[PDB]
Design a binder for these strands. Structure first.
Ligand SMILES: [Mg+2]
Ligand SMILES: [Mg+2]
Ligand SMILES: [Mg+2]
Ligand SMILES: [Mg+2]
Ligand SMILES: [Mg+2]
Ligand SMILES: [Mg+2]
Ligand SMILES: [Mg+2]
Ligand SMILES: [Mg+2]
Ligand SMILES: [Mg+2]
Ligand SMILES: [Mg+2]
Ligand SMILES: [Mg+2]
Ligand SMILES: [Mg+2]
Ligand SMILES: [Mg+2]
Ligand SMILES: [Mg+2]
Ligand SMILES: [Mg+2]
Ligand SMILES: [Mg+2]
Ligand SMILES: [Mg+2]
Ligand SMILES: [Mg+2]
Ligand SMILES: [Mg+2]
Ligand SMILES: [Mg+2]
Ligand SMILES: [Mg+2]
Ligand SMILES: [Mg+2]
Ligand SMILES: [Mg+2]
Ligand SMILES: [Mg+2]
Ligand SMILES: [Mg+2]
Ligand SMILES: [Mg+2]
Ligand SMILES: [Mg+2]
Ligand SMILES: [Mg+2]
Ligand SMILES: [Mg+2]
Ligand SMILES: [Mg+2]
Ligand SMILES: [Mg+2]
Ligand SMILES: [Mg+2]
Ligand SMILES: [Mg+2]
Ligand SMILES: [Mg+2]
Ligand SMILES: [Mg+2]
Ligand SMILES: [Mg+2]
Ligand SMILES: [Mg+2]
Ligand SMILES: [Mg+2]
Ligand SMILES: [Mg+2]
Ligand SMILES: [Mg+2]
Ligand SMILES: [Mg+2]
Ligand SMILES: [Mg+2]
Ligand SMILES: [Mg+2]
Ligand SMILES: [Mg+2]
Ligand SMILES: [Mg+2]
Ligand SMILES: [Mg+2]
Ligand SMILES: [Mg+2]
Ligand SMILES: [Mg+2]
Ligand SMILES: [Mg+2]
Ligand SMILES: [Mg+2]
Ligand SMILES: [Mg+2]
Ligand SMILES: [Mg+2]
Ligand SMILES: [Mg+2]
Ligand SMILES: [Mg+2]
Ligand SMILES: [Mg+2]
Ligand SMILES: [Mg+2]
Ligand SMILES: [Zn+2]
Lengths: 98, 63, 65
RNA sequence: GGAGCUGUCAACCGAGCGUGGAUCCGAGGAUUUCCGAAUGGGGAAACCCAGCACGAGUGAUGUCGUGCUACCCGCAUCUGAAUAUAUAGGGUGCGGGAGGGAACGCGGGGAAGUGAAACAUCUCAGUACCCGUAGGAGGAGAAAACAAUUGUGAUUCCGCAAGUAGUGGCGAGCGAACGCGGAACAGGCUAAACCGCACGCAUGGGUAACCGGGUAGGGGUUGUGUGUGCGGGGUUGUGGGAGGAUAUGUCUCAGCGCUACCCGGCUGAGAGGCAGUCAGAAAGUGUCGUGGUUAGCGGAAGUGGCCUGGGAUGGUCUGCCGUAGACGGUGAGAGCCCGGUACGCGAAAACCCGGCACCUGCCUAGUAUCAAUUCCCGAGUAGCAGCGGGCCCGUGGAAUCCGCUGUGAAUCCGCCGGGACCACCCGGUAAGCCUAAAUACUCCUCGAUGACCGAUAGCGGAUUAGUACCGUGAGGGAAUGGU
RNA sequence: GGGUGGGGGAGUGAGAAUGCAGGCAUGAGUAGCGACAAGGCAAGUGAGAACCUUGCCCGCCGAAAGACCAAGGGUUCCUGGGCCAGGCCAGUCCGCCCAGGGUGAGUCGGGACCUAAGGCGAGGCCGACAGGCGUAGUCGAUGGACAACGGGUUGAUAUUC
RNA sequence: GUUGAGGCGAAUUCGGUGAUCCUCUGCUGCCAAGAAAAGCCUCUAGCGAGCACACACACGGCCCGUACCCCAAACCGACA
């Protein structure tokens, strides 16, 4: 019943683009697809005790693959790109050094 | 007009119309429904209803 | 995993604190798995199950245990 | 329940759990996004946007969590517009409905192709289809019935009667009933006269002559008369009730019926009898089952020899069980190898059924005799006329039954039926309601079976199946099993 | 899994229905290989090159055969692999196959603002039932209102970073 | 210059021509006589004890689309 901000942030995105943004101190997360930007900002600030400048979101449709005779569709995801305030303590992704 | 009585609920009946050559076609028997402005108490407000002449002939409604 | 029998002595606030601790632990495990340094992948199922256990205990306590 | 387990295509791994009882099987509970009758508002179904209340969070807007917020109907309450009485309408609080489902039921609407060697009457057929509306079944059901000189005695269903009597452009066709043999059996509540009690109206707006009757007085005014409702009374066809005169108190008690008395009668309570989840009243609470259902457990007897063989369950010698020689598996035809089978045990809990108590409610004098003076016995109904429908019956001499229109009765000396009608006789008692069983069906769940199919068969579907694919859409709709 | 005999029962016999389903011939290594812009050489890669990569020539479009959208499509985009199916030839290539990646908005186009034609429609009126129409209202852009420009950057986004 | 990225980086004046664009929801002419609502401004009804404004600082700005084809080999034509 009681809501936790960690229910909104699912996992970090690990890719070359994400590693590039990490140097700029911008973090990419996979979030629950129903969330909105303000809720994400509040949740990140609460979780990491950090200051957030802005949040960018994008919905990505899942890929279609065929397996033996028919097509199946992977799940759609929502990505949030979070840029910290100019001079905030970095978020330690705990394994994503870039 | 208005083939259903508001008081007793009497509705139309269905049958056949028969010609000289005995061709039978469907037709209706409609009750004699007439407009009435009915009051519930003397000098009260009138309400318009659709009732049949049998209900009028009986004391079922009052003007 | 924590057992329901040993859970059923915490009153309400200890249960809530345990639930918060479990959610934080699950968050950390999800991040570790995502970045690929988690070895025992059964921990996620274990933590999910104990979260469900705590929720069940709380709900049944509310509904006339 | 007892040693493995982390479902399957469908493997490969990875990482773990388990005798401190896992996986697995049964029951109860918790959780249960969004759409959908979908119901806060909107919407291209699965999306968008809110209001109120309470919490969370923020430096504060933003943001989050949980509840409630459709429409209509019924009931109860507050308000009573134009407008006065008032009503419409409005507010509030409680309940209820909506939609789905394979078949079966009931009520209503209702084809054509086809047959008639053409075709309109007729048939097809009250079928297909449609609408309304149920229940585990439904509809019907307790004589205003049959019968015919005797009698039967609510309804339903099966077999006959019988392809008969009949009916029919007497064409094609259609087609009863009486009665007989069976399955299953069951009967009950009301309305009315009358008597009381409450709201309403006229009259005395006091001469009521009433207030339990009377025995005499008392206040003498609240009686008198009807409507709306609640009680009592009543429920029958050999007519029965209401109302009168002879004819009496399950058992008791408190009150009251204007007063002293007889007889009462009413209310309430206690005492007894009866009945009960039922058609005849409606719920709930405990406890008990040789009760049942939802997991399951036990359960006899060959490691037999030889031959062939990859392999014995085959052949041949032998041994045994059998309340078990059903079926299936196992490296080839297995009662004795395995799951099992005969037979016998087994239920925390939940549900069903039954029993006993609690509990509920009914019974608290009227029985018979006489009187034949009066009242009542279901109304815009019956009957009659017109137009139709349906009955074997196609309008015919057309009874019985149903609908619309018109006219329109009487309460037992009444009224209806016995195939036009009349007289006599016989039967019955319409216009209020309820009612088990015998009958119909299987989306579904268990357990069986087959001189049924065996992959172009059998379901469209043994395979990704209402899938792929085709169509804007309603719809149409495959093919593919075997080391 | 069969034979024979006494009986019982059939989805019991195919060559023709311009029959149905599957397989396979003949025509035949035949027609065709989809515009009248046009290709060539050198080098490379490779088992394999007319078609792929690089360079240089030549030619064609240029009110399109260039550059952006909307509708529609749906991962066809990028990177790394692949080469038995597909591409009217071959293919080392690909809009094909496999894995991973990639779409960042207070101002752009929409909603949260507004209404047109039209749709639905509380009550309501009408209609045997089914239902028809319609008021309040509520939806409905193709229209009204409303705040951003220049440059850079990625393999793949940019008035978004 | 592994031909990727890097580093530096001049001058930038005056004429001609000239719109399908702007002034212009303007102007002129004509008859066939040419949406609505929000928005904005204003009036009062009303509310009202606190208000309106200037500067500075710090903040909040939501949901969906955004890849690629788009006179086509990626759309409608069974087909590149
Ligand atoms: Mg939850
Ligand atoms: Mg930004
Ligand atoms: Mg966006
Ligand atoms: Mg693919
Ligand atoms: Mg009506
Ligand atoms: Mg006909
Ligand atoms: Mg009449
Ligand atoms: Mg279980
Ligand atoms: Mg809704
Ligand atoms: Mg709606
Ligand atoms: Mg008034
Ligand atoms: Mg229904
Ligand atoms: Mg015909
Ligand atoms: Mg004919
Ligand atoms: Mg013929
Ligand atoms: Mg039912
Ligand atoms: Mg019934
Ligand atoms: Mg009575
Ligand atoms: Mg009465
Ligand atoms: Mg066993
Ligand atoms: Mg051998
Ligand atoms: Mg065998
Ligand atoms: Mg056997
Ligand atoms: Mg009667
Ligand atoms: Mg008649
Ligand atoms: Mg007739
Ligand atoms: Mg007749
Ligand atoms: Mg009549
Ligand atoms: Mg006679
Ligand atoms: Mg009945
Ligand atoms: Mg029955
Ligand atoms: Mg088949
Ligand atoms: Mg075969
Ligand atoms: Mg389609
Ligand atoms: Mg043979
Ligand atoms: Mg034989
Ligand atoms: Mg044959
Ligand atoms: Mg043949
Ligand atoms: Mg043939
Ligand atoms: Mg030739
Ligand atoms: Mg040629
Ligand atoms: Mg060509
Ligand atoms: Mg060469
Ligand atoms: Mg490409
Ligand atoms: Mg190839
Ligand atoms: Mg080829
Ligand atoms: Mg409408
Ligand atoms: Mg309506
Ligand atoms: Mg409108
Ligand atoms: Mg709109
Ligand atoms: Mg527009
Ligand atoms: Mg691009
Ligand atoms: Mg883009
Ligand atoms: Mg683009
Ligand atoms: Mg486009
Ligand atoms: Mg195409
Ligand atoms: Zn009437």
């Amino acid at each position: 019943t009681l809501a936790d901000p960690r229910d909104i942030i699912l996992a970090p995105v690990i890719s070359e683009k994400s590693y590039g943004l990490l140097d700029d101190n911008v973090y990419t997360f996979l979030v629950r697809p129903d969330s909105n930007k303000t809720q994400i900002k509040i949740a990140v600030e609460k979780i990491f005790a950090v200051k957030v400048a802005s949040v960018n979101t994008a919905n990505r449709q899942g890929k279609r693959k065929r397996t033996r005779t028919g097509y199946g569709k992977r799940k759609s995801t929502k990505r949030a790109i979070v840029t910290l305030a100019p001079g905030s303590r970095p978020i330690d992704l705990f394994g994503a050094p870039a | 007009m208005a083939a259903v009585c508001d008081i007793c609920g009497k509705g139309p009946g269905f049958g056949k119309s028969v010609s000289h050559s005995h061709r039978r076609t469907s037709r209706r028997w409609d009750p004699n429904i007439q407009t009435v402005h009915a009051v519930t108490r003397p000098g009260g407000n009138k309400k318009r209803l659709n009732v049949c002449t049998s209900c009028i002939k009986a004391g079922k409604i009052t003007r | 995993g924590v057992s329901p029998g040993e859970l059923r002595e915490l009153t309400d606030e200890e249960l809530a604190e345990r639930l918060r601790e479990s959610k934080e632990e699950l968050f950390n495990l999800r991040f570790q798995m995502a970045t690929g340094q988690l070895n025992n992948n059964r921990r996620l199922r274990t933590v999910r199950q104990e979260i469900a256990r705590i929720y069940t205990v709380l709900r049944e306590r509310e509904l006339g245990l």
